[PDB]
Predict the 3D structure of the following.
Amino acid sequence: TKFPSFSQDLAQDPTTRRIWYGIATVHDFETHDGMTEENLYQKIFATHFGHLSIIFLWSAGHLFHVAWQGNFEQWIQDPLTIRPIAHAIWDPHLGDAATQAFTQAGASGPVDLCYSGLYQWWYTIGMRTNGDLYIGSVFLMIVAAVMLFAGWLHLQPKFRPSLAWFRDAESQMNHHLAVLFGASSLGWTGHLIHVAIPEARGQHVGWDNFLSTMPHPAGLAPFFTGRWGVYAQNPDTAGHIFGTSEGAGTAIITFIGGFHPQTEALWLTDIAHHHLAIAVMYIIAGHMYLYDTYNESLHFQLGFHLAALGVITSVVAQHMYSLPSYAFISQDHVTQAALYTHHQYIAGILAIGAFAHGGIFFVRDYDPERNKNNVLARALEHKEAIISHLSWVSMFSGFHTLGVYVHNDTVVAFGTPEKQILVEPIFAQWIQPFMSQGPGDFLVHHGIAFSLHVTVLICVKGCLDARGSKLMPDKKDFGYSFPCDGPGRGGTCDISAWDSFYLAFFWMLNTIGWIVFYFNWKHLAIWSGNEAQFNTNSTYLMGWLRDYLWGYSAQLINGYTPFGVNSLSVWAWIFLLGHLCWATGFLFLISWRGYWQELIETLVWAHQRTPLANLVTWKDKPVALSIVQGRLVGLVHFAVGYYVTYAAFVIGATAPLG
Amino acid sequence: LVKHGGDPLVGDLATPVNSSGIVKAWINNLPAYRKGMSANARGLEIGMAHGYYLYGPFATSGPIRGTTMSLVSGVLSASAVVIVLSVAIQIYSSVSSAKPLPSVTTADPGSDFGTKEGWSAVGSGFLIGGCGGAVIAGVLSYAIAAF
Amino acid sequence: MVQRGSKVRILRPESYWFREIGTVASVDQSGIKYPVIVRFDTCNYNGISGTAAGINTNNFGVHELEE
Amino acid sequence: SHTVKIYDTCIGCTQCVRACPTDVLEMVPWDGCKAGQIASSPRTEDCVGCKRCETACPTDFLSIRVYLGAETTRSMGLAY
Amino acid sequence: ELSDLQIVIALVVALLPALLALNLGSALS
Amino acid sequence: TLTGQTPLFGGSTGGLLSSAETEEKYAITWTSPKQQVFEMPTGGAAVMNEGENLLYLARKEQCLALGLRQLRTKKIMDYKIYRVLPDGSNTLLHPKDGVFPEKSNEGRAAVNSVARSIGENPNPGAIKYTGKKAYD
Amino acid sequence: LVPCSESPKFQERAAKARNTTADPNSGQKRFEMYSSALCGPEDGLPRIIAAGDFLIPGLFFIYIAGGIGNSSRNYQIANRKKNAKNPAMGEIIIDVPLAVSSTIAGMAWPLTAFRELTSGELTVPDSDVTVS
Amino acid sequence: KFFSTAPVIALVFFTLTAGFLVELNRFFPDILFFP
Amino acid sequence: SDILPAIMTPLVVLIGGGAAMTAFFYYVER
Ligand code: CL7
Ligand code: CL7
Ligand code: CL7
Ligand code: CL7
Ligand SMILES: C=Cc1c(C)c2cc3nc(c4c5[nH]c(cc6nc(cc1[nH]2)C(C)=C6CC)c(C)c5C(=O)[C@@H]4C(=O)OC)[C@@H](CCC(=O)OC/C=C(\C)CCC[C@H](C)CCC[C@H](C)CCCC(C)C)[C@@H]3C
Ligand SMILES: CCCCCCCCCCCCCCCC(=O)OC[C@H](COP(=O)(O)OC[C@@H](O)CO)OC(=O)CCCCCCCCCCCCCCC
Ligand SMILES: CC1=C(C/C=C(\C)CCC[C@H](C)CCC[C@H](C)CCCC(C)C)C(=O)c2ccccc2C1=O
Ligand code: SF4
Ligand code: SF4
Ligand code: SF4
């Protein structure tokens, strides 16, 4: 059957495997039939415009919805008591009770409270009316229209960029550093100085009057002539109220440091300074400006960029709660928990994605001859060593961390908490925005250490053994994703490199889960004033189960009761949806293909033999999902479940507290 | 009544449930299988039967049940379900090549299911029948309630 | 490399016994690409899942083998 | 279908051919090895992919290697 | 606070990327 | 034209489905010394009649399982397997040379024999965008 | 962070204490012993700081771990020298004489370690180390 | 022979090590840190 | 255009989802 157009192997599959594997391989452009590197890069090029158009229409939706259905105005008036709103609920299924309960944040009808700090971010960057947002939205739709127009024009042979424009990666690297990053950085400082900071200081800047307005009275004259001093004018008084004349300074570039007390956020002036500095550094480096493999392999490129975006989004999460850059976001606890957990989980996805494409590189692109004695060749030279070391630090960190937590559990249970192995984080004290690191924090840090070790252990045993191993010397033959080599050599289930990404996603979720668990319990403790609770109970595992999971679940799971619904109903329900989704992942992770294939055989029999029903038949012979599809659907359920459950819990834990 | 295999190599046991006379009589005379019906007729009967049946769960069990509006729900719900089945028949027929094979219960299934012509006919039937069924059942529900 | 007994370190990369000393037990056959038939002390992975024993002797390549 | 490729190091033990449940494999005469035979895979349109052949092969870096692709009715092992 | 004129214009604009998405999608297929 | 007597079998559900008619049956024909009872691969026990017995099964593996596991155990090595198309094209498959594939016979080419051993197969990095596989 | 004696929380914990051992004084003895170590003011629970706390029991642990590792290694050498086939009744069945000799030569690993380190006796060449 | 076999050998050894550590803990009180 | 929710939601979810599922059905079955 035609679909999938690109793969005749599949298109001639007489089964439902054709439809699944189609959708699974529909973006592996490399593997499409008759795909030359030229067309490959051109196709990829156009897809990226599609992606970006999506991101812009996504942002567009944010602004459109908050404008139309939000309470952004009411919130800018009372940003500490008004709950900000994400969008309207129209749902024919809600009972009157649930419409009433979701009728919140002084909204006429049922709404969803926002928890992306979008209100805070927009207030900070200057937006003050629904008009500013509506214009942002319509603008961003038009940007997306342009980006789509672009991908279309580009794939059109008129402007179809040949292999040249892509082979010029070095040019692209320098351009990214300066022309994109540097340029946009200082453009953003433009926005900050002209609109953000004014609107912060109570002065309305529209597109109409900013041509009229000058940011700094003497600033225009100072540029290129003693520019640094004039720019550092009267700094904004602590008295200053955000978006009011009261205590408004005039400085546009400063190094005041710390946080604006009203908003408990990094000074807009400090941010503008930061960005100006970042821009200068980036542009300078641009002007100033494994080679073989990186240019050769698109997998190497994504892998690198994913590991990059991995660390970047991790640090974004780590910094965006410690060093709040948005007004009132520090006070909005649910948003800050949500954003941290969000960005940390996306961090873990981008990280593991890095190692995934790592392994794809090692089975599709890495030629051992091509690079005689490169870093990668040396890495493989002593795989057994890199793995034995990662193994050891894993078994070590693991045995000891689990042992200590279990020791603490045992002695505390036996009613002798004195006997606990409480180790103080001395180096944390030395280094220390920074919150008290106790022996609890120590144990959890080591947990996270161990888990991150086992994750990299797995997703490197993957990318190293991808080429092969004693159990399967020639894996590169069979490729990245394949079921197994059969029950041949004691059994080879899960021997592929894809299987290592699969096995490591679990550890990535465990690791980020420990991270965000620690984050959220610590913060709930402080946000309730019972930081004592964390400090005392975080040292044995029953304390995590009793105080974190058991204790902060109560509100959420009372979201709907036989007595009635409250606003947390939708979260209680999502909480269960995530438990169900997670568990459903176990169906696919534990029950493997053969059981199902026998069962489905019998259903094919029953269908063919049932009068009236037999009148219709499948086009595609029903078959059980593939070995690997079982693993993949398992993992997507497990992951989706994991995320949805925890998102529900993060929201439901923090929301009642505030 | 004993289990025996017609063409023993085929995976189809004649049983009192699939090969009995009473059963063969019923199955082979249901409008799917009944000989000498225009495909449109097959569909109109299948439709009417299902629409009429479908009215009941929707009217009885749904969210606005008890109220007068429940009858309207019943009819529109059943008709919606019939429209969705009408879509299913069209798209099925669009992509279907397969013909109903002769079975133990039905020695001569026919061609009305098994040709794109047949399925289009059946679907036109099924739609008119189903939505008619559903309306009739609401009309009768109002009638009997009033009486 | 002696047929009755030997200590050859296999240089076949796709081998369970790469870099392991083995005692040859068969004369290199004329016209046989891989005639060493080195017996290695350790067993291979060979066998159905949960097969305890495996293969001890493989016909190793002369070029790959080294005294 | 599944490509079954027999590599140089086939010691003609006839183990694979006795394993194959769809008899994809025929032990053919070959002067390459002392055995006087090799494995041939003519009937790879009947290869289900069970790899009982690979499982039965005793050579280190087994000569018989089955490569799964372009699943068909006969590969997928469908009665129906 | 957002008027119907504005809601409509937003929709009509959003229709543009819709058409162009159809176009780009077709291309990439 | 592939004529034998169908083994006495009461019938099952394990048999041929629509694909038998629509696409391709198989047939195993063997010569039985006695009227002995054998496990039907569809599930059940059938009793092979004296002499030539013909069995229509649904895949080759079903046929070769009756043959390799049960018939050959009963020492009946006369069995011939025929792919049967709907038109009635009966095509001998298993003993195509008339000799069991384990026994080497002449006039059977080496098919998919690879010169280079497993070790020496090319890396995919090298052959990227050539459309040649490692084994190929 | 502050001596347990000094910390008022620790004194509270000491007053009402659970006796581990049969003897009534086990609780008081434990707290008296724990008085030496520094404990957090709010918690009043003994903490461990990375020499007496961790280094000394670390050393004892490492000695015992090295002993048991060395004993196992020595017994493995005994296995590969006792018989032509080491595994059969060499691992599944434990030769008590060989084992006790291995244990006796065990716990001398600290002195033995100097000799083992000399000429890299412990390490086997990369070339030899079987790795596909 | 039975004595040689891992299960019995290990059973005795660990029933000794476990008892030894139990006895140690029985005699010496809770030792969190080396005094 | 307070009602635009009560139109846009069924249109997109029911009608668009239906049409999408129908189209994807044709697409993977043709
Ligand atoms: C016209 C401008 C508009 C945009 C850009 C937009 N919405 Mg809405 N939109 C919703 C989500 C949404 C998302 C996730 C999203 C981001 O892409 C947007 N929207 C964006 C739901 C909250 C709600 C659901 C009903 C429903 O979806 O309403 C129809 C929405 C339409 C006409 C806008 C379509 C424009 C989007 C840019 C398309 C994005 C496509 C995507 C990038 C491609 C990848 C697909 C992906 C799944 C892989 C909704 C509403 C709704 C409306 C209306 C009028 C809109 N919208 C309008 C818009 C409902 O009444 C109605 C509302 O009133 O609800 C009460
Ligand atoms: C998750 C880690 C990961 C990341 C972050 C990542 N990849 Mg890969 N990646 C690709 C590109 C890519 C890009 C451009 C990219 C950009 O950042 C990434 N990747 C990133 C293509 C080269 C290549 C093609 C991928 C491939 O062909 O894409 C098609 C896959 C499809 C349509 C399935 C998508 C469905 C999702 C799984 C589940 C979504 C659930 C959803 C939430 C619903 C929830 C319901 C509700 C309750 C919320 C690819 C590979 C692949 C893999 C793997 C494992 C990955 N990846 C992994 C990752 C292949 O094997 C695979 C491969 O074929 O290797 C040989
Ligand atoms: C999506 C989450 C959901 C689930 C999983 C779910 N419901 Mg509800 N759900 C119902 C039952 C139900 C069952 C039995 C069930 C089991 O899985 C579920 N649900 C499950 C009904 C009470 C209610 C009715 C829905 C409604 O009436 O749907 C139509 C019901 C029909 C077409 C099926 C009837 C099945 C036949 C009888 C089968 C008989 C076969 C016969 C033996 C064969 C031989 C024939 C002949 C040869 C003799 C419903 C609701 C409803 C809703 C909603 C939103 C839901 N649900 C939601 C859900 C109504 O508003 C609505 C609400 O109003 O609730 C009062
Ligand atoms: C995909 C090809 C197709 C097109 C282009 C198309 N229809 Mg139909 N189409 C209709 C309208 C229609 C309009 C107004 C319209 C163009 O303006 C179209 N269609 C066009 C309704 C009168 C009628 C019923 C309502 C109908 O299905 O939806 C109402 C039509 C809408 C909002 C206008 C959008 C145009 C869509 C492309 C049509 C969507 C059809 C889709 C396959 C099913 C979606 C889910 C469905 C369960 C509601 C209809 C039929 C139906 C089908 C089918 C298969 C189609 N269609 C198919 C199409 C029914 O059986 C079904 C059938 O009942 O009729 C025989
Ligand atoms: C509670 C859940 C859970 C645990 C405890 C666990 C345990 C471990 N996983 C390991 C690895 C992995 N796990 C993997 C996939 C998964 N692992 C998962 C779930 C877990 N896995 C899941 C869901 C997956 C996805 C399939 C992979 C892919 C790996 C590895 O490569 C990695 C590994 O093996 O690295 C070498 C180890 C990582 C820590 C280490 O190396 O030594 C630390 C050991 C710990 C923390 C637990 C030890 C338990 C105790 C201490 C042992 C003795 C307990 C008793 C005394 C035993 C006697 C009992 C008798 C008396 C009856 C360790 C054995
Ligand atoms: C508390 C709830 C119950 C928890 C345990 C439930 C386990 C059920 C798992 C299924 C097992 C069913 C029986 C299968 C029995 C069976 O044959 O399983 C088969 C299984 C694997 O057999 P394989 O086929 O892999 O082995 C292949 C060979 O047969 C030839 O290839 O064997 C093992 O699991 C090995 C480990 C045996 C046991 C190892 C532990 C030894 C110490 C055990 C001490 C027990 C003390 C008991 C005291 C009362
Ligand atoms: C449950 C289960 C199944 C059976 C589940 C199957 C076959 C999927 C069942 C069908 C799903 C629910 C949807 C398929 C039907 C949809 C209606 C498709 C619509 C899309 C069409 C247009 C293509 C497996 O096949 C399997 C394989 C390997 C490991 C584990 C498992 C496993 O756990
Ligand atoms: S994946 Fe399944 S088929 Fe393959 S080795 Fe594992 S159990 Fe056997
Ligand atoms: S590949 Fe193995 S089983 Fe096949 S003929 Fe060679 S040695 Fe025999
Ligand atoms: S995979 Fe199985 S059926 Fe196919 S050739 Fe090998 S042994 Fe024969």
User: Anything to note?
Assistant: The CA atoms of residues 73 and 79 of chain D lie 8 Å apart. Chains D and I do not touch (no CB pair under 8 Å). The radius of gyration of chain D is 12 Å.
